[PDB]
Amino acid sequence: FEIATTGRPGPVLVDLPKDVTASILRESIPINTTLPSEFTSEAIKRAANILNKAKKPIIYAGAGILNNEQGPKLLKELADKANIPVTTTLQGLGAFDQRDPKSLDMLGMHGSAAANTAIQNADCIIALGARFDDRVTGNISKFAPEAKLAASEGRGGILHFEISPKNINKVVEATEAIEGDVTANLQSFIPLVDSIENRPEWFNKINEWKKKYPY
Amino acid sequence: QLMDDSFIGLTGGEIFHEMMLRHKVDTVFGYAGGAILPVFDAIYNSDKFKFVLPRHEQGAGHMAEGYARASGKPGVVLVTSGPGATNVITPMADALMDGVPLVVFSGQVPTTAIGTDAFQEADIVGISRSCTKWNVMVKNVAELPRRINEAFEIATTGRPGPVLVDLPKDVTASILRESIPINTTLPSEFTSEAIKRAANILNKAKKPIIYAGAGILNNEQGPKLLKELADKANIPVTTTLQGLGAFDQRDPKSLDMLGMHGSAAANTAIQNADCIIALGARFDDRVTGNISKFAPEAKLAASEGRGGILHFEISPKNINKVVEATEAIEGDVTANLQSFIPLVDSIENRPEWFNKINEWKKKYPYSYQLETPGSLIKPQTLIKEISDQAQTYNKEVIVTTGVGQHQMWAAQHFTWTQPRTMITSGGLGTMGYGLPAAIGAQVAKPDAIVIDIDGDASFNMTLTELSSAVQAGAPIKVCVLNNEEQGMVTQWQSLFYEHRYSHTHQSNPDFMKLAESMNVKGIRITNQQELKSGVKEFLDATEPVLLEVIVEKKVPVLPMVPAGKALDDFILWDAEVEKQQNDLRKERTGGKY
Amino acid sequence: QLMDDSFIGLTGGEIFHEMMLRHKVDTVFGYAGGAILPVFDAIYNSDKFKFVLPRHEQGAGHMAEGYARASGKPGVVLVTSGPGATNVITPMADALMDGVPLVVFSGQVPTTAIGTDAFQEADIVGISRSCTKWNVMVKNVAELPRRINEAFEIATTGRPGPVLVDLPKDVTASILRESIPINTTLPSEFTSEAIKRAANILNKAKKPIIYAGAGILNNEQGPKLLKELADKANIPVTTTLQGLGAFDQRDPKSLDMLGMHGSAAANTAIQNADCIIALGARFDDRVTGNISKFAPEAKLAASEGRGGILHFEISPKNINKVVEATEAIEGDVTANLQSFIPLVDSIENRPEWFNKINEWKKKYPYSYQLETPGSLIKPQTLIKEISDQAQTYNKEVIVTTGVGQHQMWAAQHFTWTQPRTMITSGGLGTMGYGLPAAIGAQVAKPDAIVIDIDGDASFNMTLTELSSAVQAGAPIKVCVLNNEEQGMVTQWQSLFYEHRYSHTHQSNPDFMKLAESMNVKGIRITNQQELKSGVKEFLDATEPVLLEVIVEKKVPVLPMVPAGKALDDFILWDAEVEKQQNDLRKERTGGKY
Ligand SMILES: Cc1cc2nc3c(=O)[nH]c(=O)nc-3n(C[C@H](O)[C@H](O)[C@H](O)COP(=O)(O)OP(=O)(O)OC[C@H]3O[C@@H](n4cnc5c(N)ncnc54)[C@H](O)[C@@H]3O)c2cc1C
Ligand SMILES: Cc1cc2nc3c(=O)[nH]c(=O)nc-3n(C[C@H](O)[C@H](O)[C@H](O)COP(=O)(O)OP(=O)(O)OC[C@H]3O[C@@H](n4cnc5c(N)ncnc54)[C@H](O)[C@@H]3O)c2cc1C
Ligand SMILES: Cc1cc2nc3c(=O)[nH]c(=O)nc-3n(C[C@H](O)[C@H](O)[C@H](O)COP(=O)(O)OP(=O)(O)OC[C@H]3O[C@@H](n4cnc5c(N)ncnc54)[C@H](O)[C@@H]3O)c2cc1C
Ligand SMILES: COC(=O)c1ccccc1S(=O)(=O)NC(=O)Nc1nc(I)cc(OC)n1
Ligand SMILES: COC(=O)c1ccccc1S(=O)(=O)NC(=O)Nc1nc(I)cc(OC)n1
Ligand SMILES: C/C(NCc1cnc(C)nc1N)=C(/S)CCOP(=O)([O-])OP(=O)([O-])O
Numbered sequence A: 001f002e003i004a005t006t007g008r009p010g011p012v013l014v015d016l017p018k019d020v021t022a023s024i025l026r027e028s029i030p031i032n033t034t035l036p037s038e039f040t041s042e043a044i045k046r047a048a049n050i051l052n053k054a055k056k057p058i059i060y061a062g063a064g065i066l067n068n069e070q071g072p073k074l075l076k077e078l079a080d081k082a083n084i085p086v087t088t089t090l091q092g093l094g095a096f097d098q099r100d101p102k103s104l105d106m107l108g109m110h111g112s113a114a115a116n117t118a119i120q121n122a123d124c125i126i127a128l129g130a131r132f133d134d135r136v137t138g139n140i141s142k143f144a145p146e147a148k149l150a151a152s153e154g155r156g157g158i159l160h161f162e163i164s165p166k167n168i169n170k171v172v173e174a175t176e177a178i179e180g181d182v183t184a185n186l187q188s189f190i191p192l193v194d195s196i197e198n199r200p201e202w203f204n205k206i207n208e209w210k211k212k213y214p215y
Numbered sequence B, C: 001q002l003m004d005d006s007f008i009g010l011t012g013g014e015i016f017h018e019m020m021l022r023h024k025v026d027t028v029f030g031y032a033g034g035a036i037l038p039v040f041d042a043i044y045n046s047d048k049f050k051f052v053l054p055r056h057e058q059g060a061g062h063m064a065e066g067y068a069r070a071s072g073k074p075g076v077v078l079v080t081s082g083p084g085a086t087n088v089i090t091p092m093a094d095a096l097m098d099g100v101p102l103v104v105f106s107g108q109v110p111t112t113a114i115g116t117d118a119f120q121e122a123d124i125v126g127i128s129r130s131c132t133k134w135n136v137m138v139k140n141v142a143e144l145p146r147r148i149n150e151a152f153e154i155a156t157t158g159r160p161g162p163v164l165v166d167l168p169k170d171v172t173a174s175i176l177r178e179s180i181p182i183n184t185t186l187p188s189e190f191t192s193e194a195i196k197r198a199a200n201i202l203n204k205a206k207k208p209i210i211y212a213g214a215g216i217l218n219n220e221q222g223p224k225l226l227k228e229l230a231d232k233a234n235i236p237v238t239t240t241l242q243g244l245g246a247f248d249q250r251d252p253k254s255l256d257m258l259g260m261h262g263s264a265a266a267n268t269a270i271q272n273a274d275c276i277i278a279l280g281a282r283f284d285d286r287v288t289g290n291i292s293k294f295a296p297e298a299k300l301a302a303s304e305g306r307g308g309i310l311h312f313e314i315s316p317k318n319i320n321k322v323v324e325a326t327e328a329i330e331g332d333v334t335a336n337l338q339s340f341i342p343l344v345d346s347i348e349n350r351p352e353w354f355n356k357i358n359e360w361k362k363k364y365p366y367s368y369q370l371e372t373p374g375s376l377i378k379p380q381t382l383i384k385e386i387s388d389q390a391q392t393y394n395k396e397v398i399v400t401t402g403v404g405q406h407q408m409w410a411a412q413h414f415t416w417t418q419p420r421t422m423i424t425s426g427g428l429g430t431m432g433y434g435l436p437a438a439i440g441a442q443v444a445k446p447d448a449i450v451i452d453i454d455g456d457a458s459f460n461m462t463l464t465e466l467s468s469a470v471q472a473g474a475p476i477k478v479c480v481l482n483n484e485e486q487g488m489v490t491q492w493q494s495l496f497y498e499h500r501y502s503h504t505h506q507s508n509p510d511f512m513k514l515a516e517s518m519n520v521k522g523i524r525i526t527n528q529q530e531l532k533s534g535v536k537e538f539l540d541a542t543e544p545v546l547l548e549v550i551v552e553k554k555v556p557v558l559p560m561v562p563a564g565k566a567l568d569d570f571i572l573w574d575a576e577v578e579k580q581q582n583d584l585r586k587e588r589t590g591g592k593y
C-alpha cells in the first residue's frame, strides 16, 4: 500500500501461495508491521526568479496536480496571481476550470491549436505534474522553441514540478527541476512569485488564438 | 546446394576450432577446466592461432580487451564453467562500458545437469546479461556455427562490445550428424538530409570545436578524415580520454583532452563554442561537468539558428541520451564524414576565435609543483620523461594504464599522436587492467613498445600476470608509480573529507624481488638523479621489465572540475595553495602524511 | 514510542556504522573507491570492528567466506561501485553454492546517475541476482537500517547464503531527517508426524548409514547430536567434503568421505544400506555418482516398507530435488535431531552389518604408490605428514584449500575430528580460494593454526593476497603442492583424452623469492629427506609462512567414480596399472611427461 500510493502512484502485486494463506500464525510479529530540503528550496527560489522575468508564461498542468486535494486550488491561485494562461493534458482535464478566460483547453496531438500555439510561443513553461509524453510534445526537437531560447538567454525556460526523478529531464531539459509533490511545492513557490495585474500583448495573442482556433 | 555436410562427423569442439579459423582468429586467451575440455582437446597443439594462458581468467579477459583495442579485431576468450566464467564478469562489464569487441566462450555443465545446482554450475547467461550486448547458451551442435557467427557479428557491429556464448560440455563433446545451412558455416535519405543540414550549420559557425572520441578510432580512415575536416574548416580539436591519439597533439589546432581532469583550455573552449562537432563520443559524465551548465554557447546558438551540437553517433541509444543534438547523424562516423566534408566550406582563417584559443592554451598549461633539491621525483615529471624518451625509438608506442592519478597524469603528460595507442579502462575504471591489457596489446603488436603506466595499488590487483607475460613471450614494460597510496582516493579524502585517510594505504611488496621471482627484469628509480638513466634502461630492455619509481605522495591531479561544477569552473594548480594544503595535511594528521 | 529519532542528524554512512555494531560485526573485509567514500569516512578509525584490506575485492570476498565458515558469523564485505562490485561476483556465486552467509555492501553511483551508463556504474543488482539469495538497492537513508536488518536476517536463516545491498553515494552522504520505526533500528504438527514416521523406519533398519553434510555444522550442538544418534542406534557415518569434521574420523563407526573421490568403503556402504539418514547434505552430483543407480538397497527397502531415505533438510528447494526422500524432515537438522533421537531405539550390536563395514574399510584404504629411492615426494605422503605433525600442537587446526588434486588429497588424508576445520570451495570449486579464505579464517580464529593446502595453479590465481596476510597480522601457513601442472585437469586428459595435455601447464614464479618479496617466511622442500624437518619448520613458524613442496607429477587421485558410473563402480589404485599408465604416457608424449 505504501509503494502503490507514494512517489508517482502505481500498481503493485502481492502473490499469495495457498499454503501461506491457509497457514496459521504461531509467532508474535513486530508491532510496527501490524499498522499501516535545502536543495529544492533553492531551486524553488530560482524558479520564482525566472517566472518573475517572464513576459509570455504558460502553465502546462497534468495528472500530478490531481493527486492532492489542494492541487487545483493552488494551480488557480498561481494562475490568478501571476496572470498565466493554463493548458492541461488529457489526464489533467478538470484540474482547471475551463470556463475561466485563462483556460487554453487541452494541448497536444488532438488538443486545441490555440494551446499548441501558445506553448510553442511561451518564454516560460510551468510544468505541473505532467510528463511531456509523446502525444503532447509533437516533434520533440521542435518543441517549445521560445522557452528554450529564453532559457539560453537567462529570461525563462521550463520549470518542472515533478515527484518522480525518473521523469525529470527524461524528455525535455528542465531549466529548474522542483522535485517532490507539486502541491506542497506550490505552497512554497507562490509567495515568491510576483503578482501581475495585466499582460496586454501576451493575452492579446492568447485571445486571438482562442478565437482563431475553436474546435 | 544450400545445405552443407562438411562438418558432419566433427565434435562441437572441432567445429569451434574450424569456426575460429574462418573468423580469422589468430589469438585466443583462456584457461582450461572440466566443462570446456572437449574444446581444449580440439584445439590441442593447433598451429592455427596463438593461445595465451593467463594466471586468472580476469587476466584472460583484460588481455583480450588490450588485444582488441590494439588490433581492432575482437578479443577471444575461452574459459571453463562456474568460477572460470564468473571470473570474466569484470572484463565483460569493462568491455561493455568502453565499447570493446570481446567474444567470450564459457564452458557449461552438460545440458542434462543445467538447473540442478550442478558441480561448477553458474547461471552465466543470467549473470552476464547486463554486462554483454548479447549472450546465448548453445543447446545443440547443429546450431553452434550459427551462434559463433552471430556472436562475432554482434560484437563487432554497431557500437562494439562484449558477447558471451555458453557451451555445455555434452554439446561440445557431441558429434554433428546432420547437414546444416551453408550460410551458417561462413562468417539513407533521412541521414543524408541530416548531414546536409549539419553542414549548413557548421558553415555558419564562428567558434567551432571538434569533440572527438573512441568512435573515430573504429575505422582506419577515421583520424585521417578528422584531420581533413579540422584542416578544411579550420577547427580546434579536443578529445576524450578514449579518443587520445585520434588527433596529432603536436598540431596547433590541438586543445588536448577535455573533462574533469582535462585541459582548462579545452574545457574553456567547449564552454564558449557556438558549434560542437561530436565525433564518436558519448558525453559521459567525466567529460560534461555539470550537465545543465554544459556548452551554454552551443545551446544558445542552436536556439538562435546559428550553431549547436552535431552528433555523429552509431548507437541510437547514445543519441540524445545526455545532451540534445541539434542534428543527429546516425551511423559510422568515418563513413558519414566522407559525405559531410565536401558540403563543408573551406575556411582560411578565424582570427578572433583562434586568438582566444591561443590565449587559453598559453594560460592553461598542465602546471604542477616541480622537483626541489632533495625532493622525491614528481609523478608528472616521470610521465614527461617516459614520453620524451619513448618517442625516440623507431617503433610504435602503445600505452596501457591502471586506474587512478597515474592514469590521469599519463593522459595529460604524454604527447598523443597515433590512433589505438592509449589503452585504458575509462567507463568502468577497473584497477588491475594495466598489466593484462599490456600483454594483450603486446601480443597484438609484437613489434611495438608497450608500456603499462601503473599505480602501485592497481598493480597489486593483478601482478600475478607477470608470469603470463614471460610465458607468452610478451616483452611488456611496466612502470609502477609507487606513491604508497591509493592516490586518487586520498586526493578526494584530502579535498572533501578533511584529510581523513580511511583505508587507502595498502602495503606493497618489494617490487624488485617480485620481478626477480617472476623472471622479469627489475629497475628501481629512487631519486631525481636516477630518473633519466633508469627510464633509458627501461625502454632499452628487450625482455619483460618492471620499473618501480618512487614518487611524491599526496599530490593532487589538476586541473580538476569537481562534482556539481560547470566544465569551466575548474580548480587550477597554485604553488602557494599547494604549500598551504601540505601544511594543513601535516597539522591534521599529526605529521603522519 | 514506536518511532525512533535517535538516528536523525546522522549520515547514511554513520547509520551504516552504527548498524554494524548492533549486528555485532567485529570484522569487515573491503576496499575503498569513490562511490563508497561516505561510508569509509564514517568508519574512519573505528575501534568497533577490525577492517581487513585485501589487494583485490575477490580477495575480500573469499576472506569473508573463510571468516564466516570458521566463525559461524556472517562475513561482511564493503566495496565500491562498478569494478569493485563486479569483482565480488565469483565470491558471491561461491558463497551461494556452498551455503556461506555473506553480506556484501557495494557502493553505487548517485541515484541521479543510475541508468545513464555513469562513471563506474554497474548494474550489480541485475548481475548478482543469480548469485545471491536476495539483493536490494537502498533508495533513501530512512530505509537503510531496515535493509541492513533484512540482509543479515536473510543471509543467516534458512540455508545460509550471500546477499547484496547496493548503496548509492547520495544516499550514504545524505542525512536522516525523519524518525523511523524503532523495530528497524534493532536486529509443526506435520513435521512432528514425519519425525515419528522416520523413527519407525530407522527402528526397522538392519543396514543403516548416516550421510552427513555441511548443515550439521550450522548449529554448535550439531556434531554432538550426530554422535549421539550414531552411538544410540549403532550407525556408521560417512560425510561429504563439506561435512568433514562433523564426525570424529577416529571413531570406529567412521566411513570417511563418500563420493567421486571418497572412500570405496563409504561408497560401497551407502550403495548397500537399507536406510540412509541424510543430515544437512544436498545429494550433489559429486556425491551420488550415476543418480539412477544411486542407493539401490535404500530404494528397495522404501518400496518394501522397511527403510529408505530420511532427509533432514532446512531448504524445501533441496528436498526431493535429486532423490526422493522416504520421509522429509523440514527445518534445522540439529533441532529436529533433538526430537528424533528419543524416538529411536537403542541398538547394542549389528554383527552382520558391521562385519561388512569392517571388511570394506580393511579392503578399501586410500592406497597409492609410495616413494621409492630417489623419487619425488608423493603428494599423499606430504598431506599425511602435515596432518600427523599439526595434530601435535595445543591449538585448533583449520585447513583451507585451493581446487584440484591437492584438495582431494587433503580431504582424504587429513584426519578430521573437529567441526568448521575444513574450509574449501566445493559447489563452485573456485581456484584461488585457499589463500584469502585462510586469511579470513585466521582473522576469525586468531589463536588457531590455519593451513592453506594449495595447488600451484590455484595459488597463482590470488597470490597477491600474501601482502594482505602480513598487513592484517594473520600468521597463515600456505603449503603449495608444486607439481608444475593443473593436476586435476591433466588427470582427466590422461584418462579421457589420451594424454593430450592442452594448455594445462602454467609457468610458476620462484615461490621462495615471491615469499621474500611479500615479507613472508619461505621454506622449500625438494626431496624426501627434507619432508619431516621442513614440515616441522612450517608448523613451528609464528609468522606468515609459505612452504613450497616439490611433489610427484602426473599422479591420479584415486579412488575415482567416473562420470556415468554408479557410486560403487569405482577405479581403485593398482601398482601395476600405474606403471603401465606411466609407460603409456611416456610413449605418447615422446618422453615429455
Ligand atoms: C488516442 C489518444 C490520443 C491522445 N492524445 C493526447 C493529446 O492530444 N493531448 C494529451 O494531453 N494527451 C493525449 N493522450 C494521452 C497521453 O498519451 C498521456 O496519457 C497524457 O498526456 C499524460 O498526461 P499527464 O502527463 O498529465 O499524466 P501522467 O502520464 O499520469 O503523468 C503525470 C506526471 O506527473 C507526475 N506526478 C504524479 N503525481 C505527482 C505529484 N503529487 N506531484 C508532482 N508530480 C506528480 C508523474 O510522476 C508524472 O511524471 C492521448 C491518448 C490516446 C489514447
Ligand atoms: C579516474 C578517471 C578519470 C577520468 N576523467 C576523464 C576526463 O577528464 N576526460 C575524459 O575524456 N575522460 C575521463 N575519464 C574517462 C570517461 O569515464 C570515459 O571513459 C570517456 O570519456 C569516454 O570517452 P568516449 O566517449 O570517447 O568513448 P566511449 O565511451 O567508447 O564512447 C564512444 C561513443 O562513440 C560511439 N561510437 C563507437 N563507434 C562508432 C562509430 N564507428 N561511429 C560513430 N560512433 C561510434 C559509441 O557508440 C559511443 O557513444 C576518466 C576515467 C577515469 C577512470
Ligand atoms: C574437485 C572436487 C571434487 C569433489 N569431489 C567430492 C567428493 O568426492 N565427495 C564429496 O562429498 N564432495 C565432493 N566435492 C564437493 C561437492 O561438489 C559439494 O560441494 C559437496 O559434496 C556438498 O556437500 P554438502 O551437501 O554437505 O554441503 P552443501 O552443498 O552446503 O549442502 C548442505 C545442505 O544442507 C542444508 N542445510 C544447511 N543448513 C542446514 C540446517 N541448519 N539444517 C538442515 N539442513 C541444512 C542445505 O540447505 C543443503 O541442502 C568435490 C568438489 C571439488 C571442487
Ligand atoms: C565440470 O563438471 C561438469 O561439467 C559436470 C557437472 C555436473 C555433472 C556432470 C558433469 S561432467 O560432464 O560429467 N564433467 C565432469 O564432471 N568433469 C570434471 N572434470 C574435472 I577436470 C574434474 C571433475 O570432478 C572433480 N569433473
Ligand atoms: C564514483 O563516481 C560516482 O559515484 C559518480 C558517478 C556519476 C556521477 C557522479 C558521481 S559522484 O557522486 O559525484 N562521485 C564521483 O564522481 N566520485 C569520484 N571519486 C573519485 I576517488 C574519483 C572520481 O573521478 C575520477 N570521482
Ligand atoms: C581505490 C581506487 N578506485 C576504486 C576502485 C576499486 N577497485 C577497483 C577494482 N577499481 C577501482 N577503480 C583507486 S583509483 C586508487 C588507485 O590507486 P593506484 O593504483 O595506486 O593509483 P594512484 O595512486 O596513482 O591514484
Ligand SMILES: C/C(NCc1cnc(C)nc1N)=C(/S)CCOP(=O)([O-])OP(=O)([O-])O
Pocket: B031, B032, B033, B034, B080, B083, B084, B087, C402, C403, C404, C405, C406, C407, C429, C430, C431, C432, C454, C455, C456, C457, C458, C459, C481, C483, C485, C486, C487, C488, C489
Ligand atoms: C584448471 C582447474 N580447474 C578449472 C578451474 C578454472 N578456473 C577456476 C577459477 N577454477 C577452476 N576450478 C584445476 S582444478 C587445476 C588445479 O591445478 P592446481 O591448483 O595446480 O591443483 P592440482 O595440480 O593439485 O590439481
Ligand SMILES: [K+]
Pocket: B249, B256, B411, B412, B413, B414, B415, B416
Ligand atoms: K598531452
Ligand SMILES: [K+]
Pocket: C249, C256, C411, C412, C413, C414, C415, C416
Ligand atoms: K581421512
Ligand SMILES: [Mg+2]
Pocket: B455, B456, B457, B481, B482, B483, B484, B485, B486, B487
Ligand atoms: Mg598509488
Ligand SMILES: [Mg+2]
Pocket: C455, C456, C457, C481, C482, C483, C484, C485, C486, C487
Ligand atoms: Mg598443480
